[PDB]
Design a binder for this molecule. Structure first.
Ligand SMILES: CCCCCCCC/C=C\CCCCCCCC(=O)OC[C@H](O)CO
Ligand SMILES: [Zn+2]
Length: 444
């Protein structure tokens, strides 16, 4: 539909470009925000499942939590490929729209305790599709902006997008105590304290908003007429660990924190507070990116990783052993530090990756001869392709962290096994980051 698109031309940006770009960003954001809601749905639902009569083991509950990152991580690169094929307009609507399927489904499944575990697996995997909308959403919205304004534009899209996790964790525990949707078949379950739990509401609540913004994408967003070899580059694989330790930890803690808290402090209503982790984690991401812009992303990343390690070590002192020899207040504080520090890490790592990967490619093609034009060109495309692939690999952390808790608990009755692996991982990361700093990035 839009065949003349010249965002770098000031006149064009004034008469038509900015208006168009602005409308597309402000439909993009709520669409992405909702996807993140759906992606992490089981982080609030699985804790409430035994409260409605389900008898799944602890590991099974963590698994339901973990799996949507597997399918999300898998579809991220296919999803980025989709937006040039079907256009940003129809694909945003569609990638938003289909999420009504798991939402609606989970609602009924949750009211029937004869629903097999297998059915929840399937739903869990379907929610994961929402994890892939990022790759697609981000790819798309960059085309609507000139180079000078893309950082701001992508920052806001991804930024507010990641907010979806904490807004879902915020309202899901609240709507779950109301008897709305009675006429759609919601049924309450009386709890020990005398109140009533409407678990269907946790997912059903997003259906009206999903539908509203599917429409908004279809009629409101526009289409604009305007990779393999990068896997061989070893630096991509090194960088992918860093993002996975940061972004993967943001998501992974988002998925597993509430379930873990219940296993460690069974008498705390953690869903009253859990949303605050992903909240500050999402805000930290943008702060991480801003600090990297001014200070250098590897420097920020390195310090952050050191904090990540320290804070993951402190977490052991907060735990009960075995009866109740622990402290929930310290446990929470520390996790907020880990949430914050993971989010910050997301942003510093992401910024660092694109910087390091641009200069590596620039220097390489210059070294074999080639115009500055061809140098900038191949630096552009390769980093774009590198960043997509990293962002896919990173999401795997969202599976590994809660799944590790689950296996740790099932095999030892303690989470200490899972936390030992995390600590080691962070330690290796500060070493890896120290390395690139000494090897590439100290000279900037
Ligand atoms: C002219 C072509 C018209 C094509 C219509 C496209 C409809 C898409 C949005 C509604 C999708 C379902 C939203 C409501 C689900 C509930
Ligand atoms: Zn190197």
């Amino acid at each position: 539909v839009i065949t003349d698109w010249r965002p770098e031309d000031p006149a064009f940006w004034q008469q038509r470009g900015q208006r168009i770009a602005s409308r597309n960003l402000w439909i993009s954001v709520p669409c992405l925000l909702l996807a993140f809601c759906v992606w992490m749905l089981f982080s609030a639902v699985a804790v409430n499942l035994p409260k409605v009569g389900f008898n799944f083991t602890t590991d099974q509950l963590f698994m339901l939590t973990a799996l949507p990152s597997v399918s999300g991580a898998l579809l991220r690169v296919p999803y980025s490929f989709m937006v040039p094929i079907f256009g940003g307009r129809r694909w945003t609507a569609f990638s938003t729209g289909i999420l009504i399927i798991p939402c609606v489904w989970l609602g009924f499944a949750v009211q029937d305790t004869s629903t097999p575990y297998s059915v929840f697996i399937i739903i869990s995997l379907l929610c994961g599709f929402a994890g892939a909308n990022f790759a697609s959403s981000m790819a798309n919205i960059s085309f609507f902006f000139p180079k000078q304004k893309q950082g701001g534009a992508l920052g806001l899209n991804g930024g507010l997008g990641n907010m979806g996790v904490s807004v879902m964790q915020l309202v899901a525990p609240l709507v779950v105590s109301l008897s709305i949707f009675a006429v759609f078949g919601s049924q309450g379950v009386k709890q020990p304290d005398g109140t009533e739990l409407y678990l269907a509401n946790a997912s059903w609540i997003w259906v009206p908003f999903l539908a509203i913004f599917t429409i908004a994408a279809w009629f409101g967003m526009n289409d604009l007429a305007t990779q393999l070899p990068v896997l061989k580059r070893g630096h991509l694989w090194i960088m992918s660990l860093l993002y996975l330790a940061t972004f993967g930890s943001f998501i992974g803690f988002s998925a597993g924190f509430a379930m873990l808290s219940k296993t460690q402090f069974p008498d705390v209503q953690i869903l009253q507070y859990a949303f605050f982790g992903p909240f500050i984690g999402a805000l930290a991401r943008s702060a991480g990116g801003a600090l990297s812009d001014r200070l250098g992303g590897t420097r920020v990343t390195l310090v952050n990783f050191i904090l990540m390690a320290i804070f993951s070590g402190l977490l052991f002192l907060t735990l009960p052993t075995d009866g109740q020899g622990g402290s929930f207040m310290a446990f929470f504080a520390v996790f907020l530090a880990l949430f914050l520090t993971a989010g910050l890490g997301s942003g510093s790592t992401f910024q660092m990756i694109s910087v390091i990967f641009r200069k590596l490619t620039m220097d390489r093609v210059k070294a074999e001869g080639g115009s500055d034009e061809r140098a900038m060109r191949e630096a552009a495309t390769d980093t774009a392709a590198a960043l997509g692939f990293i962002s896919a690999i990173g999401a795997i952390g969202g599976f590994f962290i809660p799944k590790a808790f689950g296996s740790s608990l099932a095999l030892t009755g303690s989470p200490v096994g899972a936390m030992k692996v995390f600590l080691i991982f962070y330690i290796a990361c500060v070493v890896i980051t120290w390395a690139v700093y000494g090897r590439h990035s100290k000279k900037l």
